Paper text:
Here we report the single-particle cryo-electron microscopy structure of the native transmembrane channel-like protein 1 (TMC-1) mechanosensory transduction complex isolated from Caenorhabditis elegans. The two-fold symmetric complex is composed of two copies each of the pore-forming TMC-1 subunit, the calcium-binding protein CALM-1 and the transmembrane inner ear protein TMIE. CALM-1 makes extensive contacts with the cytoplasmic face of the TMC-1 subunits, whereas the single-pass TMIE subunits reside on the periphery of the complex, poised like the handles of an accordion. Single-particle reconstructions and molecular dynamics simulations show how the mechanosensory transduction complex deforms the membrane bilayer and suggest crucial roles for lipid–protein interactions in the mechanism by which mechanical force is transduced to ion channel gating.
Two of these classes represent the TMC-1 complex in different conformational states, designated the ‘expanded’ (E) and ‘contracted’ (C) conformations, both of which exhibit an overall resolution of 3.1 Å. Because the E conformation has a few more distinct density features than the C conformation, we focus on the E conformation in our initial discussion of the overall structure. The TMC-1 subunits in the E and C conformations have a similar overall structure, both including closed ion channels. In the C conformation, however, the TM10 helix is bent approximately 9° compared with that in the E conformation, and there is one additional helical turn of TM10 in the E conformation. Upon successively superimposing the TMC-1 subunits from the C and E complexes, we observed that in the E state, each half of the TMC-1 complex, composed of TMC-1, CALM-1 and TMIE subunits, is rotated by around 8° compared with the C state, by way of an axis of rotation that is located near the TMC-1 H7 and H8 helices and oriented approximately parallel to the membrane. Indeed, in comparing the C and E states, the amphipathic TMC-1 H3 helices move farther apart by approximately 11 Å, thus underscoring the magnitude of the conformational change. Of note, the E and C conformations generate distinct membrane deformation patterns. In particular, the E conformation induces a more pronounced membrane distortion (thickening and thinning) close to the protein, resulting in a longer-range membrane deformation propagation (around 50 Å away from the protein). The putative ion-conduction pathway appears to be closed, with a narrow pore blocked by three constrictions. Examination of the equilibrated membrane structure around the TMC-1 complex indicates a deep penetration and anchoring of the amphipathic, paddle H3 helix into the cytosolic leaflet of the bilayer.
Residue numbers in the entry:
A (entry chain C), E (entry chain E): 18 to 201
B (entry chain A), D (entry chain B): 75 to 459, 664 to 886
C (entry chain D), F (entry chain F): 18 to 63
Write the structure that this text describes.
């Protein structure tokens, strides 16, 4: 009985995970670091138990992701450099196959920006390109790519993509739901 | 008062329902949940008893649904295996395994439907069969002592003769008694007919429901999409499921190549070239493909015709129709692939053309085999005329085809994946040419070909389940073996594809092919039920001149003759044809609506 | 015993037990026949 | 070189084609035309002979099309009359007259189709009929001398008996000879069957082509429309056709009222009210309407049943089925209108409800009359069994119905429009209440009711043209009389409506109703052709056991028996039902696509 | 032979009228003023024959139109206060039932503005309302109407409607082609 | 002549010629039975 009935009830209302999924996620969280994760966590313990960003990034699911740090930062709480069990649950419930398209779009947009001003500028797109491609494209090549992206995905002529334009553009791609998914 | 209470209840219910689908933090979600719970508790003593009862019933329904879901998640198998395949190979390879798991679930449901109402009651009646029922069913449930000595011969068994012919697996085993027994009064022929109809109805319902869930509830906004090449190849350019280093490097290289080729195509925009050699090669390849299709038709017809014997004249030649068709089904695709090398063009349209040719070959073989089998059974029944059991014979042919298909699939997996991989590993150093860096390679998972194999097998199961009630029960074991062997082969022998494309990039593509196959397979079953006459010496329908007579004879026993004669006239051809015309007219109306909406959307996009 | 009425059962039983042993053994090990592209490139260079 | 020449030719052709549809001045248009002509003349000596020949053929085709159009505009009647009606009453009233003119054209085309190939060859064969043909056709083309004395009695003539029964107007007049004569070899029964099928095919084609021209080529952008209340009620708020002072003042008042009520509705946005009296009145009215519909069914059935005599027992009672049905068709609508006063609500939905009730009444009367007529003919044929001619009798009933409908329409026009208007004009000073300022008034043109009258008459013509070949020829005169009398009545007696609404505000609304009526009318003709057997003493099909036998006997004379037996099996019910299922499936797919497109459009509009 | 073969050929290419329609329109033009319209007009005579705006507005087709003056001004040539035979033909070919929806929309937009700056401002809409309604609406009523029109038919927030917005709004009305039509 | 075999032709001919005369006469005049709203208002006021 790691979690009480009310804890699992709240978890099921908030997330897309059943009791078995919650138990499996807790087992994985404990396996990430047995010393820092208490066995008994009834009450407010989950909100106070934290792991370093590197320790969470060490898991096989996020090991090879170019945007692992961005995912960890986006799904973290106000604390910087620490990820809690609740944030872990939120992260792996957003990426689930049961999550709706709107939530995935919102969190993908939040991941793909870096400054955090709710806009995908030239610098953010360039950083994303050099992260995904692994600096295997020439500077002219990259710049042409951001030029195309900004000119074909902008309606207000702001040279920046807001959340509404990003959703309107990439929600019609049939491969976003298929790709933006982590099984756990 | 009442309106304010209704508004508050609606707002609280909407907030609680949408709490999960909100991009909020966990602390914010918990705070909102507690606030909503406190507000509902405060508002509890605001309404009358009826609203309280309604809220209580809704809460009970929600709790029971949650409990059922929690119990259901404990009975979902092959999650770790599919997760490992996804992490090692990607999210496009694992689509085949998820499709196979869904097919297994559907087949299990069909098995339960056909086992609760047909096989189990008949077996229970047989166990308690009296002297009269034993005497009435000895001729169909007991193997004759003349043939009982030859019941096991490695050829009688391999052909499902002997003990298997007199088993609940086949149509001729079931009795003609209108009632199973006393104190039960179970109509077995009616159960047989209704179960056969219900299996097709449930298959249609399940396929349509899966299609609606995949499209209408998930990608209803994907309609009327345009351009967005760089957006779709950059924002959806990384597979989050991949967790292997080599697969990650392959994905990085693939995305780099995709971006480079898209930019190269968009830069020059010049397409001028005309070589007679390429056109000659293309037309030659498209001609030899048709020649091979005709050769396949001829081989299938010849194999069916040569199996003109019903008595045990010979068995090393009677089993040539399952060995031939399966061979084509497993050997012609790869040859097609080789021909696709002659016709060099865009890999995406090459894959689409290969899928089209394979689908055409499968449908042509299906139709040819069905026609040849029906003609052969008609000729044999005419020549022999107690009367033979053509339904049991057709069931035997279908079951033998399925078994040989499984055997050939196992052999192909062993040869193409395991032995070829070992040969490449241990013979690339001293070969004549570098096989590892040349065409041979180690092997890639063909998602579309394997899914088409699954769909073809399911079509055979749908076609042959009327004559073989326990065909889906065997298909369950076949599908489980297929899943395990395919997982092992992909994990141990295959390498990730350097760049894997999709024929349609749509979720309901294979489901649409499956629905088309279901219609194609319900065509001949419907023809058999409507036209052909049951055997007089086997099966549960031996007392009627038609398969549907068991249903009409009960309908006519509860409906007056005058109204029956009035309703029979709607089935007239001159009334049916206007219905077809009306359906075509509404199809034309809906097509015009779709075209107008598309034109309006394109005009709005161009203007704005 | 019998050449046409009993030998095939013995052969099938031997094949079945051999296949069961092969499946059980292969369910406890993680063969990976292909080699990574890095190993292929290293072999090609040398 | 060649590519530049092709581009120049395409640009010149596009400019010349689009010259008319351009919002340019006349001088600019002429300058562009001369520039294009000079450029084409300069570019003439640039291409080879093949391009010159292609351009010459295209120019000849365009010139011939222009000449044909110029000749065609000289044969379009009733232009000044429709223009006057439009200028005096508006562009919604004249829609009925344009619809009537199109219906007249379609009926004339049908008349020509049925007259070139059936009536004219048979009349020519009769004129040159030898002794043998005269002897063979005397029993059906010559009135017996016993009855010839009573050929004209004001009741024999009014019932289309006597000389009219033995006229080319009816089915029984035509002969059974397979060939009309020597050196011609004209098959008359085949011509009859093919003309009957071709008339329905051409009617379907014409209705669909008109629908496509009205919607797809004109208002393809009107799909997915929303709001725009003030824009649509202000930018499209004046009828440019109106050229009368009183009608202009009425239009100004109507637009003022429209704007005021739209603003009043948008201001308060409060809808709270519940009176038991209004609900009781509404349910009472909806109950008495159903009671009157049942009473209409009972009256039609009683009138058909009482006409149980085939011999001349009495004629003042046999003619009660045309006088009753027509009466309902002309008297029940106005009563409906009065009931609509009890059910007070939005005038637009009131008009839609009235149209729905009238359509339901018309369809119910149609079905009841068809069923009663078929049952009566079956009973009479069974009782009497040379054999009677049921096709001629059915044709006579349809023709009498059409004639009585015209008579009742003329009487209703005279009473409601002329006499009521005169009574209001000369009796409003000293009446008990001010009729001029009260409900009586002078009268308004009911566009929807009159269009439904036209559609009902056309449905009768479609139903009865197989048994009466010259029914459309009579309907031409009926439609011409109707157009003239309606124009006179609207010009002389009616006043413009203070505010006229539309049921659907769509161009293809009445055309859609007409297509539905065409399908409903082709249902019983198809049943008759497929099921019923021809009479053995009348008509051209007296030598066959079925109506379609004249076609199959020729198909079987050019097609082998084996392939015929193979193709007959597709008509099996078990093959037909899957076709229906497939059509329903594609209808469901198109409906889901339409719903998804609409949802995407609404979401895009809401977001942006 | 009022018009030569080439004159009628050019008229048929430019307009939607056949030879009979051209002859009828010429007859009506002559009937408007027999003295000012020469019987013989072969050559360039149609471009030089003009009638006053009032004389053309006297015809029954345009007599009761509130926007008769606007129609005459829109369809007139560079000359002010004069309408020629070619402009008469253009006017009655634009209003025909054979004219396409786009041409009708363009000329309706050109009619509905008064200043001539390709924009439907508050003043132009107010003038159109007071012309169509005949000053039967209160000032608050009128202003409310233009407020609704501008707010529900504007995409750039310019408080003015351009041609593209006007077409996009009123081309989906089923009563525009039915109403914007003059039979002759 | 005949009461049941010839009177109806005479009646029909008389009706037909009378109807032809009525149609020809009514094709040369422009009757307008209703009165305009202005006349109705003027009558109501007086
Ligand atoms: C009637 C037809 C009878 C045919 C019966 C043949 C049954 C053979 C396949 C049985 C089977 O299910 O094999 C499962 C086995 C398990 O593989 P897996 O657990 O996925 O291994 C993990 C990867 N490291 O996966 C394997 O295939 C094990 C390897 C065995 C070699 C292939 C078996 C056919 C010989
Ligand atoms: C078998 C059935 C036979 C019935 C035959 C009855 C024929 C009567 C209608 C004939 C007809 O077409 O009337 C045309 C007549 C012309 O009216 P119109 O030219 O439009 O007048 C211009 C308006 N100022 O319009 C008229 O209706 C003239 C008025 C005649 C009164 C009504 C006719 C029925 C009496
Ligand atoms: C989805 C499942 C429930 C479908 C199973 C098939 C149904 C339609 C079949 C299977 C068993 C059948 C019943 C078996 C026994 C009887 C008793 C007999 O005197 C009347 C018919 C009746 C009542 C049958 C009606 C049809 C029936 C209910
Ligand atoms: C739209 C129009 C053209 C349709 C008219 C109906 C057509 C289909 C009918 C009317 C006249 C018919 C023809 C009349 C005479 C003959 C000669 C006979 O020995 C063979 C059939 C043949 C050749 C008939 C074929 C069908 C036919 C052409
Ligand atoms: C069963 O059938 C056999 C046929 O010979 C008969 O002898 C025997 O009496 C029967 N027994 C019954 C009625 O169960
Ligand atoms: C026509 O039929 C009559 C029947 O009596 C017969 O007498 C006469 O000879 C026939 N004439 C022909 C063959 O035209
Ligand atoms: C890899 C997971 C193995 C556990 C699940 C095995 C279930 C096998 C039978 C499934 C169909 C009933
Ligand atoms: C008012 C115009 C009258 C001239 C046209 C008369 C044509 C009448 C017959 C039309 C159908 C052939
Ligand atoms: C069409 C088929 C052509 C090839 C036939 C081979 C046997
Ligand atoms: C040789 C038969 C080829 C059939 C191709 C079917 C696929 C159509 C779309 C190709 C692009
Ligand atoms: C015939 C079955 C469907 C074939 C489609 C080819 C593309
Ligand atoms: C492919 C299926 C087409 C219909 C087959 C009917 C065969 C009846 C035996
Ligand atoms: C989004 C709906 C896609 C439907 C795809 C249907 C594919 C049919 C292929 C026929 C072969
Ligand atoms: C199934 C049981 C037998 C499997 C092994 C068969 C070996 C044949 C050689
Ligand atoms: C339903 C019809 C009810 C009224 C019947 C009147 C006869
Ligand atoms: C009494 C029958 C009423 C039928 C109404 C049909 C029209 C449906 C739409 C009304 C709003
Ligand atoms: C039944 C015919 C159609 C009636 C429609 C009423 C709305
Ligand atoms: C309404 C028409 C419905 C079908 C009528 C068939 C009558 C056959 C006689
Ligand atoms: C014989 C001519 C009869 C004309 C009657 C017109 C009514 C339809
Ligand atoms: C724009 C297409 C409108 C089609 C209207 C069809 C009306 C059908 C009415 C049935 C009664
Ligand atoms: C149609 C010819 C007769 C018309 C006048 C009939 C008068 C009946 C009284
Ligand atoms: Ca940014
Ligand atoms: Ca932007
Ligand atoms: Ca397989
Ligand atoms: Ca009528
Ligand atoms: Ca302006
Ligand atoms: Ca604007």
């Amino acid at each position: 009985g790691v979690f009480t009935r009310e804890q699992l009830d709240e978890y099921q209302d908030c997330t897309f995970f059943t009791r078995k999924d919650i138990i499996r996620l807790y087992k994985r969280f404990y396996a990430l670091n047995p010393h820092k994760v208490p066995t008994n966590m009834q009450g407010n313990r989950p909100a106070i138990t934290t792991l370093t960003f590197e320790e969470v990034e060490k898991m096989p699911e996020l090991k090879e992701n170019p945007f692992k740090r961005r995912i960890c930062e986006v799904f973290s709480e106000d604390g910087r450099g620490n990820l809690s069990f609740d944030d872990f649950l939120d992260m792996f419930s957003v990426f689930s196959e049961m999550a709706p398209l709107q939530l995935k779009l919102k969190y993908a947009f939040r991941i793909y920006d870096y400054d955090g001003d709710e806009l995908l500028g030239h610098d953010d797109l360039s950083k994303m390109i050099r992260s995904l491609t692994r600096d295997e494209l020439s500077d002219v090549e990259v710049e042409f790519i951001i030029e195309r992206i900004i000119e074909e995905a902008d309606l207000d002529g702001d040279s920046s993509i807001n959340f509404a334009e990003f959703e309107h553009v990439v929600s019609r791609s049939p491969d976003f739901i298929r790709t933006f998914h982590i099984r756990i | 008062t009442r309106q304010a209470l209704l508004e508050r209840i609606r707002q609280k219910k909407e907030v609680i329902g949408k709490l999960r689908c909100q991009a909020w933090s966990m602390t914010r979600k918990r705070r909102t949940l507690k606030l909503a719970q406190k507000y509902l508790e405060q508002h509890e003593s605001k309404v009358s008893r009826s609203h309280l009862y309604m809220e209580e019933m809704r809460k009970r329904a929600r709790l029971m649904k949650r409990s059922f879901s929690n119990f259901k998640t404990y009975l979902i198998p092959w999650e770790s295996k599919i997760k490992r395949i996804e992490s090692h190979f990607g999210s496009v390879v694992s689509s085949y395994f998820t499709f196979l798991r869904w097919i297994v679930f559907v087949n299990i449901m069909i098995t339960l439907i056909a086992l609760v109402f047909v096989v189990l009651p008949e077996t229970l009646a047989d166990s308690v069969a009296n002297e009269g029922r034993f005497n009435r069913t000895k001729t169909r449930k007991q193997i004759p002592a003349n043939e009982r000595v030859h019941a096991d011969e490695l050829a009688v068994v391999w052909h499902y003769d002997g003990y298997l012919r007199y088993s609940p697996l086949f149509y001729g085993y079931y009795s003609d008694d209108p009632f199973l027994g006393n104190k039960i009064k179970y109509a077995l022929p009616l159960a047989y007919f209704m179960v056969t109809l219900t299996i097709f109805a449930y298959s249609f319902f399940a396929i349509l429901r899966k299609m609606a869930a995949n499209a209408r509830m998930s990608k209803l906004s994907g309609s009327k999409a345009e351009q967005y090449i760089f957006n779709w190849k950059l924002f959806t350019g990384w597979d989050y499921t991949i967790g292997n280093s080599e697969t990650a490097s392959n994905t990085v290289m693939a995305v780099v190549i995709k971006l480079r080729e898209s930019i190269a195509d968009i830069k020059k925009d010049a397409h001028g070239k005309f070589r007679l050699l390429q056109f000659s090669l293309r037309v030659f390849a498209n001609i030899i493909i048709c020649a091979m299709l005709g050769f396949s038709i001829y081989c299938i017809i010849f194999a069916v015709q040569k199996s003109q014997v019903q008595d045990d004249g010979n068995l090393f030649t009677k089993n040539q129709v399952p060995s031939v068709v399966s061979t084509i089904t497993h050997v012609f695709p790869m040859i097609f692939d080789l021909i696709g090398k002659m016709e060099n063009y865009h890999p995406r349209t090459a894959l689409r053309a290969h899928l089209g040719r394979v689908l055409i070959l499968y449908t042509v073989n299906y139709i040819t085999l069905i026609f040849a089998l029906f003609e052969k059974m008609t000729a044999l029944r005419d020549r022999v005329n107690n009367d033979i059991c053509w339904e049991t014979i057709i069931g035997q042919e279908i079951v033998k085809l399925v078994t040989m298909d499984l055997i050939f699939t196992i052999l192909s997996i062993l040869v193409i994946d395991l032995f070829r991989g070992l040969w490449i590993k241990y013979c690339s150093s001293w070969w004549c040419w570098d096989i590892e860096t040349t065409f041979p390679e180690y092997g890639e998972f063909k998602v579309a070909e394997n899914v088409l194999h699954i769909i073809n097998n399911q079509g055979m199961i749908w076609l042959g389940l009327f004559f073989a009630p326990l065909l889906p029960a065997i298909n369950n074991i076949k599908l489980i073996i297929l899943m395990y062997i395919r997982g092992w082969a992909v994990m141990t022998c295959n390498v990730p594809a350097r760049e894997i494309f999709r024929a349609s990039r749509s979720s309901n593509f294979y489901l649409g092919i499956l629905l088309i196959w279901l219609l194609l397979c319900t065509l001949p079953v419907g023809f058999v039920i409507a036209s052909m006459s049951p055997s007089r010496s086997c099966g549960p329908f031996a007392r009627y001149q038609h398969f549907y007579t068991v249903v009409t004879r009960e309908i006519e026993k509860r409906v007056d003759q005058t109204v029956l004669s009035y309703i029979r006239h709607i089935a007239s051809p001159g009334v049916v044809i206007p219905i077809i015309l009306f359906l075509i007219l509404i199809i034309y109306f809906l097509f015009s609506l779709v075209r107008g909406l598309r034109e309006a959307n394109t005009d709005l996009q161009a203007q704005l | 015993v019998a050449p046409g009425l009993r030998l095939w059962m013995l052969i099938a039983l031997v094949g079945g037990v051999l296949l069961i042993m092969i499946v059980i053994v292969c369910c406890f090990m993680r063969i990976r026949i292909p080699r990574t592209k890095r190993q292929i490139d290293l072999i090609a260079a040398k």
